[PDB]
Write a protein that binds this ligand. Structure first.
Ligand SMILES: *C(=O)[C@H]1NC[C@@](C)(O)[C@](O)([C@H](CC2CCCCC2)NC(=O)[C@H](CCCC)NC(=O)[C@@H]2CC(F)(F)CN2C(=O)[C@H](C)NC(=O)CN=[N+]=N)O[C@@H]1C
Ligand SMILES: [Mg+2]
Lengths: 231, 240, 235, 243, 244, 195, 211, 250
């Protein structure tokens, strides 16, 4: 109200409005879904065209052979954060001969976002990220909020109407978690989850964006006719 | 360092500091440039609210950037010096690295770049100055006349005016400049420029300065009497 | 006053949204991508009849396989063009090849959010970036001051844009010839331009694999305007 | 007025309202506690299960400093992680020069001075956490609690976040009913009980208990998480006392 | 953060004026009057010290007239302490030019430099301008005798006779009335004092309220002398002209 | 490099400068002008290390041309020489000093007097009736000590220089491929196209 | 061994194709002429790296000049970017001897020698490298302004053959360029292997050699 | 962090006033009275040692401070501001004069340097003006005895005699009556003590008055003998006892 001018000002009830407004830009962003078994992790992103003459904004960025995220909100902020992840995944590889843990990527994202919340002149990141990875402790899904809050989950969704997919995944939990050594079934369950966050529009060939990583599967993004299979 | 964003956007997509800079230029004494077939004439108002001045040593409104290019202005005089010094330095830097004097378009584009930078650098306000930059390209006999403004946009002009009552003298030039036949001679060109200032100036005394730039580094400021003859002929041809 | 990098309660950057208004005020620019090339057209919009309209440079070369039209505070486009050109030539130096149109656009857009209390404010200009590359063929991009860029089959920016975009929505198909796209740009310019369209207040350009980026002579554009008037009189 | 719009501005009361607002962010958090025992310290925190989609035992909140110090906080989680990251730097630079692992009083003042520094300027926001930390040094067990102002003290028992009043009562009883002191294995059970009892103020969502401990006898003066049977034995003892 | 307290000293009004410049000019209008008058055979500087005391030590006092080098002096109107910062900078340009070219600085070059510094404080830095206007009286071998003024805006102009500080309107009108081009330094001195005499806010003009300085070729042969008049000498020139 | 002579006569200054540019065992060019006009009445000849010579010459030129535009006035030879000296004296305590020696020949339009300045790469300046840099001085100084008069005409000045070039073509080891000769007088700078 | 000379019919440019690391012959098939644009050639002598890096860099700087100024760069300004660049590295131990050869309209046919001590010279004839004195000997004694294109090409080729023979460090082949108002024209790779014997037989020269 | 106050906190108001300097002069007005009288053969500077508590040892608070052996300063207004100015003033007499010329600066030039530090605090980013007015008494070989006043603005003026702070208006009028150009130092001390009595409410003795002179050289206060040209400091603080003896002839 009077306490929303910049990030360095608490409200009288202990709130940081600039952070809550940045959180707002995520709700306005298109829907994206994450879910995992014990063997594979899957990103399903609804891409959003400006109009019929325009392309559908790419939501899924690859970070390493074993890790990559999906974005909702300011795409230029998902570029800056993904680029930072690419470096940390890369620094771990070059210096320690060590694939960077999904858990430690979360901790590093969290701490980068935080510095932009406690300092004058900056601003919070205006994007939410879903990170998936296979590492030395198996399949992992992380939800990143630009408050700096990161959470390890079995499944989740961010963006407009995400709450449909997040209820469906809360019901299906015991089913999809048991989809081991079957990628196409885990993607189905991802595509069926995002469907619960659709209204008027349905999943078309240039609309849908899917990723998968797993036991013997490099993080690979399927766009266009590749995903016709799953429509 | 002082980092403050002084030139920012407003809810209706306006940069008010750039627009208030244009207001400083409106307030400035008038300036006109008229390009003939084989010359460009710069004409500049001198407000007669200052008498007991010393006209030998008072900064003249037309500045030589190089031997073939001049810069006149409207706006804050103190601002105009910084632009003239930056242009005169770039002019020598170009000679030293390209073994060639700047083109009039290159010098204009440089000064316009400098004005633009001061509209999205922290700690700085825009220049309160618009410029006419006139002259000839090395070994070329085609006249050049360019105008810059605080925002940093620049453009070529057959003829143009800037400063107070430039609306009135642009009106004049718009009906009295024929693109199919520009002032063939120096005489014709200086006559049309003095005429255009006599729409706004007041007295045809020490209120008008005229500088003639011809090809191949030939630049000459007219004297009071030489101008005063053009003033005498224009009003004797008008008594009709 | 308030931060330059400040979020509105709807989760948008004020200064970014305000710059998008400046861009709406700027003269029109239209791109159309085909399989025979990309066409870029602009309204010059001279402020006076004394201004030598061919000194109005609102279509610009970045490399031989990448052109660019601008709309808004066109002075802000200079440092962006400089960056694009330096990026294209620099890539060519380090890799001995032509730089991808998407990669060039992404380098320009990387400048856009470098503002704070870096430059003092966002850019007040939108860019239509048109090029060819062996990988993704003929391409048109829109590069907003937000740091976002969308690929388009066709896109209008500037004062005419929502009127022009509605019209491009109908007219564009995947089988347009280059010659068709040229008339289509002249047509839609004439519609949304204040002054009557001629070869002195509107400029055409295209990018073809064979000939690279070519700004059209006033004479050539005048033949296409005359061809438009006759084909619109025809029915 | 306007004295609450800028950090490091004294009100006419002589108060710094931006710090007092940070405290609100703290009071808004989940309940975390500390219990000093005979030869060590036990930390415990309330982890609200927002959804069945949270992977149990994965989002660990208690953080180790060096090898002998536990830190747990309530409030903005990222603020707390930023403070532990600094703490690790302070404990690394102290060990580097002086060889000995940082003594706990010394560690506490390193956090104290840093947080306090974030109330000295209008260009930084105070920390949105109260932090409970401690461990075993050469002089035995120490437990500390540290507030957004930079204020910190030694404690027999500490509590912060939404269930602090409840926890503080349950702690006050233990201090009164154990003057000779508590055992580390005893403190682990009590810790579980005081988190289950303090959960009444967050009783909407069901929660996931987390305990850690440093004890000269039970862990060799190293920070370890309470896991498997010893955790189950504590969750059992806790569930029995509320029924 | 800090932004809340920033005056923004280098912005344009909606009219296109610089706030701080205009307000610093207002400041200078309340400072003691300083007059410069240029003759064919020299320049007179004359200035009025602001409501002095009987206990002010006048013979070791300098608020108005400062020596820049052996050829150039200034008359100050505005904040003395602000003026001393600029004078020390101008004194160093004069000694840098003399070291670099082994020639005394031309007056208009030094004046442009001090004017460029001032201009800086009005376009960048976020600081208040200098509340100071200068009358430069100088001689060089290119233009001979030269009178300049500069003001907070960093604008400068040449003059045959000029005033700065208090009642300039009133002073400019009296100079405009009695100045002639063929005037001599003795005639100019008399003009300078008659002007102050009528534009003074005091009851009577006395020696103890004046600072006076002449730059003459009244130096033996082809060279220039600066005379910063002593109390007793001002008192003699006040009787000669017949104002006391 | 190696041959730059200057002689100040009654009403002009004459700079004579070798045309040879030699790298290793090849004369790459035999028509090199080792001079730059600094202003219409001031000419500077230069000899020293490859690259440094022209980079210093052109640098000084650009500064003097800048001063001329800014002040719409031409600095005296004395002023130009003092500027040039100070540049060298600053260079000598640099990371990599300019290894360049110059003669500055100018007509002072105020004093109506020709002036020759000799400055070495250390910034050692002197006003001389006649000067030379490097080995040349070993021959030409004693020669001019005998044959010079202050009140010589430009034609006598040129005959006196011919004597100096002949002595150098007789007794110097290297082939300096003749000299380019330029007169600085009240009417400016002109090249003597037959020597 | 590189040369370039101006004549009536424009500019001839000839280079050998040998690369040496001491007495080890590293290559006989190396390219010593960078084609900057259709009216600008650079010759390379010295450090292999120093030449290739800073000359393909000069190509980029010439490209930026025509984008920024809508006009192809002067040989003067092209030579001066290279000479200003190496002059910043003076003392660091760069090794380069180059001739920037080209035709623009303002300038006509133009050759600038630029070396790594910062020497920049305009001229009608230059020979650069270890073979330079060998090339000078043949070239200087057969050069007229009024050579035909065909004679001029040959005299360039023959001047490189000369140096390829005597100079231990030159060799491999001759690469020939002709620079006109219409731009540069490549006149082939000539393997000294065959060229020597063809020239000796046809010309009756090289009588020092067992036939 | 970083000092992000890179902009002036003293700016021109539409009336052409500098508020922060005017307000600084107001703080100086509230301050305790201090004065300076210049004799033919010396200068006296005096002020009241307004003791905050009677428990407080007012001896340990030096309101009158030696800057150089031949220069002293006294003040009115904010004692803390004054203290750090005496620190900077003493150091600048060394760095910008004594370490270059090998002698102590003359009174007018040291004043000039104090003036400069005070001006910068009216224009430098992120600071307020100093809330003091200094009276600086000194002697140098070429200017003799001098007395200067330095205001928050940086302005400084030479006085025969003057007063600043609380009771200045009255004290100045009193000096104007008593001051002639023939005064011996002792006569100027006798007048300084009279003038100071008018502005003091409570006790008036050598333990509530601080009074220093710039007079003759004090060889007894040099610390060493054997260099004739070194004759000792001209600055001398009068003792409690020395003040009380002169109060019996009052
Ligand atoms: C005519 O005069 C030719 N003379 C022969 C010549 C070999 O000297 C040279 O100047 C060539 C020109 C090169 C050829 C390759 C294309 C670019 C131009 N110079 C060399 O071949 C050069 C000689 C170096 C001595 C100055 N060779 C090298 O630098 C060689 C080449 C290499 F591959 F083998 C690598 N190398 C080196 O010398 C070593 C490995 N490294 C360095 O020198 C590192 N630098 N340092 N310090 O051709 C004339 C045209
Ligand atoms: Mg010498």
């Amino acid at each position: 109200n009077n306490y929303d001018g910049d990030t360095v000002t608490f409200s009288p009830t202990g709130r940081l409005f600039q952070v809550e407004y940045a959180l707002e830009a995520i709700k306005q962003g298109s829907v994206t879904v994450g879910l995992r078994s014990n063997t594979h992790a899957v990103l399903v992103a609804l891409k959003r065209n400006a109009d019929e003459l325009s392309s559908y904004q790419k939501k899924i960025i690859k970070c390493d052979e074993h890790m990559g995220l999906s974005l909702a909100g300011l795409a230029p902020d998902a570029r800056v954060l993904s680029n930072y992840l690419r470096q940390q995944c890369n620094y771990s590889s070059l210096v320690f001969n060590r694939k960077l843990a999904v858990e430690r990527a979360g901790h590093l994202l969290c701490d980068k976002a935080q510095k932009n919340t406690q300092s004058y002149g900056g601003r919070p990141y205006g994007v939410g990220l879903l990170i998936i990875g296979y590492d030395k402790s198996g399949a992992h899904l992380l939800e990143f909020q630009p408050s700096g809050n990161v959470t390890e989950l079995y499944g989740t969704a961010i963006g407009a109407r995400s709450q449909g997919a997040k209820t469906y995944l809360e019901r299906t939990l015991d089913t999809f978690i048991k989809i081991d050594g079957n990628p196409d079934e885990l993607i189905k369950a991802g595509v069926e989850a995002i469907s619960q966050s659709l209204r008027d529009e349905s999943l078309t060939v240039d609309n849908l964006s899917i990723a998968i990583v797993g036991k013997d599967t490099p993080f690979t993004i399927y766009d266009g006719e590749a995903v016709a299979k799953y429509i | 360092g002082y980092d403050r964003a002084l030139s920012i956007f407003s809810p209706d997509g306006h940069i008010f500091q750039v627009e208030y800079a244009l207001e400083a230029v409106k307030r400035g004494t008038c300036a006109v440039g008229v390009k003939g077939k084989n010359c460009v004439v710069l004409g500049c108002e001198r407000r007669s609210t200052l008498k007991l001045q010393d006209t030998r040593i008072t900064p003249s409104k037309v500045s030589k950037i190089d031997s073939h290019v001049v810069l006149s202005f409207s706006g804050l005089n103190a601002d105009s010096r910084i632009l003239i010094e930056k242009a005169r330095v770039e002019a020598q830097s170009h000679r030293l690295t390209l073994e060639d004097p700047v083109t009039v378009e290159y010098l204009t584009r440089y000064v316009a770049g400098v004005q633009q930078r001061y509209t999205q650098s922290g700690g700085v306000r825009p220049f309160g100055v618009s410029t006419l930059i006139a002259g000839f390209d090395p070994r070329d006999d085609e006249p050049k006349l360019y105008q810059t403004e605080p925002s940093g946009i620049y453009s070529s002009w057959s003829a143009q005016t800037i400063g107070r009552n430039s609306k009135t003298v642009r009106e004049f030039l718009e009906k009295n400049y024929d693109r199919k036949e520009p002032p063939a001679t120096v005489e014709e060109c200086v006559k049309l420029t003095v005429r255009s200032l006599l729409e706004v100036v007041q007295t045809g005394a020490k209120n008008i300065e005229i500088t003639v730039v011809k090809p191949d580094s030939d630049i000459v400021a007219l004297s009071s009497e030489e101008i005063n003859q053009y003033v005498t002929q224009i009003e004797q041809e008008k008594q009709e | 006053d308030r931060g330059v990098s400040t979020f509105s309660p709807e989760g948008r950057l004020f200064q970014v949204e305000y710059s998008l208004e400046a861009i709406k005020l700027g003269s029109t620019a239209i791109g159309i991508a085909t399989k025979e090339g990309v066409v870029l057209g602009v309204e010059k919009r001279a402020t006076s009849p004394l201004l030598e309209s061919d000194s109005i440079e609102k279509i610009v070369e970045i490399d031989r396989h990448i052109g660019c039209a601008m709309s808004g505070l066109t002075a802000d486009a200079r440092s962006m063009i400089e960056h694009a050109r330096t990026a294209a030539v620099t890539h060519n130096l380090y890799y001995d090849e032509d730089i991808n149109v998407e990669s060039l656009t992404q380098s320009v857009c990387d400048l856009a959010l470098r503002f704070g209390e870096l430059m003092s404010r966002p850019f007040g200009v939108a860019l239509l970036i048109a090029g060819h590359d062996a990988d993704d063929g003929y391409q048109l991009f829109h590069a907003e001051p937000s740091g976002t860029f969308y690929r388009y089959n066709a896109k209008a920016i500037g004062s005419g844009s929502e009127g022009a975009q509605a019209e491009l929505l109908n007219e564009w198909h995947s089988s347009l010839t280059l010659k068709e796209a040229e008339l289509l740009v002249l047509k839609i310019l004439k519609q949304v331009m204040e002054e009557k369209l001629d070869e002195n207040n509107a400029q055409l350009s295209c990018i073809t694999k064979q000939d690279g980026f070519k700004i059209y002579d006033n004479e050539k554009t005048a033949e296409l305007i005359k061809e438009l008037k006759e084909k619109e009189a025809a029915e | 007025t306007g004295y609450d719009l800028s950090n490091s501005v004294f009100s006419p009361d002589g108060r710094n309202f931006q710090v007092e607002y940070a405290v609100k962010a703290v009071e808004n958090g989940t309940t975390s506690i500390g219990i000093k025992c005979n030869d060590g310290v036990v930390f415990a925190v309330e982890k609200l299960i927002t959804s069945k989609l949270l992977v149990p035992q994965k989002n660990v909140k208690i953080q180790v400093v060096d090898r002998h110090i536990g830190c747990v906080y309530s409030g903005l989680i990222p603020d707390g992680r930023h403070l532990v990251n600094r703490g690790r730097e302070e404990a690394a630079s102290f060990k580097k020069l002086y060889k000995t692992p940082i003594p706990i009083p010394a560690f506490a003042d390193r956090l104290g001075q840093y947080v306090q520094a974030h109330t000295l300027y209008n260009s930084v926001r105070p920390f949105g956490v109260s932090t409970i930390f401690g461990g075993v040094d050469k002089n035995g067990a120490h437990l500390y609690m540290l507030e957004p102002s930079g204020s910190y003290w030694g404690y027999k028992g500490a509590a912060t976040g939404k269930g602090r009043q409840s926890a503080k009562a349950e702690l006050e009883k233990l201090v009164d009913h154990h003057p000779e002191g508590l055992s580390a294995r005893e403190a682990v059970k009590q810790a579980a009980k005081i988190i289950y009892l303090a959960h009444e103020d967050n009783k909407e969502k069901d929660f996931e208990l987390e305990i850690s401990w440093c004890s000269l006898s039970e862990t060799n003066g190293l920070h370890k998480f309470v896991k498997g049977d010893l955790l189950q034995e504590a969750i059992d003892f806790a569930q029995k006392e509320i029924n | 953060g800090s932004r809340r307290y920033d005056s923004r000293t280098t912005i344009f009004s909606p009219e296109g004026r610089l706030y701080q410049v205009e307000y610093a000019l207002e400041s200078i209008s309340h400072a003691g009057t300083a007059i410069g008058i240029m003759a064919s055979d020299g320049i007179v500087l004359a200035a009025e010290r602001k409501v002095t005391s009987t206990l002010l030590e006048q013979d070791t006092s300098t608020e108005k007239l400062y020596k820049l080098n052996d050829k150039i002096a200034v008359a100050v109107a505005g904040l003395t302490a602000d003026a001393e910062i600029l004078i020390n900078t101008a004194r160093i340009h004069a000694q840098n030019y003399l070291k670099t070219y082994n020639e005394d600085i031309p007056v208009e070059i030094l004046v442009r430099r001090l004017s460029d510094i001032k201009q800086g404080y009005t376009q960048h830095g976020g600081l208040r301008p200098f509340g100071v206007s200068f009358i430069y009286a100088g001689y060089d071998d290119r233009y001979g005798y030269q009178l300049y003024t500069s003001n907070p805006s960093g604008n400068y102009t040449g003059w045959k006779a000029i005033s700065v500080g208090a009642n300039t309107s009133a002073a400019q009108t009296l100079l405009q009335m009695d100045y002639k081009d063929d005037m001599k330094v003795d005639d100019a001195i008399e003009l300078a004092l008659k002007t102050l005499s009528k534009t003074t806010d005091s009851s009577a003009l006395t020696y103890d309220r004046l600072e006076f300085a002449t730059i003459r070729k009244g130096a033996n042969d082809g060279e220039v002398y600066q005379k910063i008049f002593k109390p007793q000498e001002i008192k003699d020139i006040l009787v000669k002209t017949g104002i006391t | 490099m190696d041959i730059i002579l200057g002689i100040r006569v009654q009403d002009s200054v004459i700079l004579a400068s070798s045309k040879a540019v030699t790298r290793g065992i090849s004369v790459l060019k035999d028509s090199d002008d080792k001079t730059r006009q600094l202003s219409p009445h001031t000419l500077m000849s230069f000899a020293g290390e490859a690259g440094d010579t022209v980079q210093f010459a052109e640098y000084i030129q650009a500064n003097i041309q800048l001063y001329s535009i800014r002040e719409d006035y031409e600095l005296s030879p004395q002023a130009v020489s003092s500027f040039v000296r100070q540049e060298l004296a600053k260079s000598i305590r640099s990371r990599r000093p300019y290894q360049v020696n110059v003669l500055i020949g100018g007509y002072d339009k105020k004093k109506n007097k020709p002036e020759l300045y000799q400055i070495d790469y250390l910034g050692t300046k002197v006003e001389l009736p006649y000067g030379a840099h490097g080995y040349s001085g070993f021959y030409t100084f004693s020669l001019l000590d005998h044959h010079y008069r202050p009140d010589m005409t430009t034609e006598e000045g040129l005959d006196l220089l011919k004597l100096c070039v002949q002595e150098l073509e007789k007794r110097m080891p290297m082939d300096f491929k003749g000299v380019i000769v330029k007169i600085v007088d009240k009417d400016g700078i002109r090249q003597v196209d037959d020597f | 061994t590189t040369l370039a000379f101006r004549f009536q019919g424009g500019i001839i440019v000839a280079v050998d194709s040998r690369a040496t690391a001491g007495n080890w012959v590293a290559s006989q098939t190396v390219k010593k002429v960078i084609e900057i644009n259709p009216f600008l050639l650079g010759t390379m002598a010295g450090g292999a790296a120093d030449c290739q890096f800073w000359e393909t860099w000069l190509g980029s700087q010439c490209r930026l000049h025509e984008l920024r100024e809508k006009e192809r760069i002067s040989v003067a300004a092209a030579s001066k970017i290279l000479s200003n660049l190496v002059y910043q590295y003076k003392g660091a131990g760069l090794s380069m001897g180059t001739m920037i050869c080209g035709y623009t309209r303002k300038e006509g046919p133009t050759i600038y020698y630029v070396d790594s001590d910062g020497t920049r010279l305009k001229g009608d004839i230059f020979c650069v490298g270890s073979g330079q004195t060998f090339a000078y000997g043949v070239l200087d004694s057969n050069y007229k302004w009024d050579l035909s294109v065909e004679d001029a090409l040959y005299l360039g080729k023959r001047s490189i053959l000369a140096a390829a023979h005597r100079d231990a460090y030159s060799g491999g082949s001759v690469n020939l360029y002709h620079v006109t108002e219409d731009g540069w024209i490549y006149h082939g790779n000539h393997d000294v292997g065959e060229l020597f014997w063809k020239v000796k037989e046809e010309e009756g020269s090289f009588n020092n050699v067992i036939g | 962090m970083t000092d992000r106050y890179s902009f002036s906190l003293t700016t021109f108001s539409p009336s052409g006033k500098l508020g922060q300097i005017d307000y600084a002069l107001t703080a100086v007005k509230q301050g305790v009275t201090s004065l300076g009288i210049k004799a033919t053969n010396g200068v006296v500077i005096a002020t009241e040692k307004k003791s905050s508590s009677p428990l407080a040892m007012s001896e340990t608070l030096s309101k009158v401070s030696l800057l150089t052996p031949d220069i002293g300063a006294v003040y009115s207004g904010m004692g803390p501001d004054y203290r750090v100015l005496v620190d900077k003033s003493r150091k600048v007499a060394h760095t910008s004069y004594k370490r270059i010329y090998g002698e102590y600066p003359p009174t007018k030039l040291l004043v000039s340097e104090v003036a400069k530090i005070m001006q910068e605090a009216t224009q430098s980013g992120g600071v307020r003006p100093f809330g003091v007015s200094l009276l600086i008494a000194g002697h140098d070989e070429f200017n003799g005895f001098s007395l200067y006043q330095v205001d928050p603005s940086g302005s400084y003026f030479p006085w025969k005699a003057t007063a600043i702070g609380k009771g200045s208006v009255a004290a100045k009028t009193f000096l104007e009556k008593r001051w002639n150009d023939e005064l011996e130092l002792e006569d100027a001390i006798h007048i300084a003590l009279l003038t100071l009595k008018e502005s003091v409410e409570g006790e008036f003795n050598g333990d509530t008055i601080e009074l220093a002179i710039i007079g003759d050289e004090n060889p007894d206060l040099l610390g060493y003998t054997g260099i004739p040209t070194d004759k000792g400091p001209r600055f001398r603080k009068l003792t409690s006892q020395e003040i009380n003896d002169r109060l019996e002839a009052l």
